[PDB]
What we know:
heterotrimer, A: 224 residues, mainly beta, Immunoglobulin-like, 5-stranded antiparallel β-sheet, 1 helix, 19 strands, C: 214 residues, 6-stranded mixed β-sheet, 4-stranded antiparallel β-sheet, 2 helices, 5% helix, binds a molecule of 2 linked components (NAG-NAG), immune system, colorectal cancer
Amino acid sequence: QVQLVESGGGLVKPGGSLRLSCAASGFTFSDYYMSWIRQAPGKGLEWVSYISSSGSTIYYADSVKGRFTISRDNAKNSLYLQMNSLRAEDTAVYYCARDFYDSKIFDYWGQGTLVTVSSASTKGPSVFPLAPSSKSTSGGTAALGCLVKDYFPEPVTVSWNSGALTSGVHTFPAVLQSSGLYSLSSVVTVPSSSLGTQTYICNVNHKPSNTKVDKKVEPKSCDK
Amino acid sequence: QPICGNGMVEQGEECDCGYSDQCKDECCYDANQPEGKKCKLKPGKQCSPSQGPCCTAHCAFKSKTEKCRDDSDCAKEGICNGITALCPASDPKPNFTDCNRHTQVCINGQCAGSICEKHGLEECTCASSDGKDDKELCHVCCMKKMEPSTCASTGSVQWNKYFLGRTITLQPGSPCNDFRGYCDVFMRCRASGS
Amino acid sequence: DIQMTQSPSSLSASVGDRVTITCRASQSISSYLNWYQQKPGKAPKLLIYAASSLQSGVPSRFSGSGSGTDFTLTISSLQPEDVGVYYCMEGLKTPFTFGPGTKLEIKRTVAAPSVFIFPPSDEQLKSGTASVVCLLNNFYPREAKVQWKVDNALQSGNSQESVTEQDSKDSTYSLSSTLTLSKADYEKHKVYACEVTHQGLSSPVTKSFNRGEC
Ligand SMILES: *[C@@H]1O[C@H](CO)[C@@H](O[C@@H]2O[C@H](CO)[C@@H](O)[C@H](O)[C@H]2NC(C)=O)[C@H](O)[C@H]1NC(C)=O
């Protein structure tokens, strides 16, 4: 198979520099050209760099030349993309790709990594459960959710039931609260019987604050 | 299907100013006119701009010695014939003139072959043992007539008398690697998928 | 300078409708052009490598075409999982240029939105604020209208509506608003509700709860 994993990317102040790495698990990494393509939050894709198998050919884009220094290590199977003097227009998600033996241009891509050039500061996400109906009916009518309040840079991951719960899960990027605060809510609808049968918990990983919170959602259960 | 009304003028008709709502050209009957005058040239008119670049807006032939086709790598500036509304055939530029960003030569009044045959040679495809063998594919190479073993790059001690330290690079769209690839902008031979 | 135009940009059609997307080129770009499909949150995927060539594993309904300055992608039969944003990228005369992007939704029969109301958590109440969430799930179209009649007083605005994308599995939407208030605001009113005015609902079905939340 082919799988590319990208690491790095976060909240960088205007100017400065940042490091980005691409790990290529399975393919003859020394027999394929590599490349980077990025997309802004609300724009289209845009190519950045194109790298030969053993160096000797390193191209960039006219909008990044003098700011991006790219490198690779075929022995370590890694693809570094160092970027310098970041401007506000560099806030985007950067995608690792493989520009094949110049054929079937980019046969595979990675999931990317968001880069935020905001001058703000990272804030820890508070987690609050959205409880289901304690006066439960039957036949499958129920719903539960988690609220990630005041989380910032952007990126957050939500895995209900540690990846077991996938069908019926819904999540969509949040909007700034008054004082520059993202607040995302994830919601899943489950059978009314399972509401009283299984235990349902949301696993949220806030990579930038490096805070991982596992909050279970249970009915109101008043009069304890 | 040679439909009258299309912006291009086909056989049978002589002018295609278009439908009435856009037929700004007064020299031509509208496409939505009676079939007797179906996209026909108006009476008492000499030409129409749709016929070619050698016509005036007042439906009169552009005079002779008036430019109609620009100068090209292998073509000289075309002058209007003064007798027809189309630009006549341009006189070709002289043989073996540097063409296609100096990668080719002006043969048959067009741009084909390569600079190799300018120097009395013929074009060939080089090959390297190890390393950046791709770059050599987008580098112009030349050979003696019917002597493939003489193949060597333009920018070498061989062919130095001809090219003088000029590693001529193929233009994008030119085939390479014995037609297996086509040279790209980044000077990397590419093609023949899979 | 090569200019890449993509028409249409927005496109809504039902299942099985034949779909054509045209990538317009300023000059004679080469045939080394590939079409890619992207879904939100995920990454783009190869659809059609060079002019009229199907990539292995891609559904076989797609069919490319085109030469010179005009290239064409043809979806023979549109399907629920074909919702997404499509791009055209050329080659060999191309600093890896990407087309503007053809967005493509799907059309389906109107479905009943499942409406659920979520009272805030107790831990947030001690912090100083409170957030009540109204939820609409698995509906079509995007048409929505949410009202927060706290103590029957139709105050509005602290709600911020979040609209998901179309689930390819069933071609439905989802939505959610978030009413935010303070502690004194929480005890300011008695009974809370959220009103829904989807066109597929013959009546404005409203889910409500008392402040006791139990
Ligand atoms: C001048 O151009 C003409 C037109 O192309 C040349 O005529 C042909 O040139 C090619 C070039 O390789 C030859 O292979 C053909 O044998 C030529 N003749 C024909 C009938 O095609 C001509 O050779 C050029 N040079 C001169 C000195 O006239």
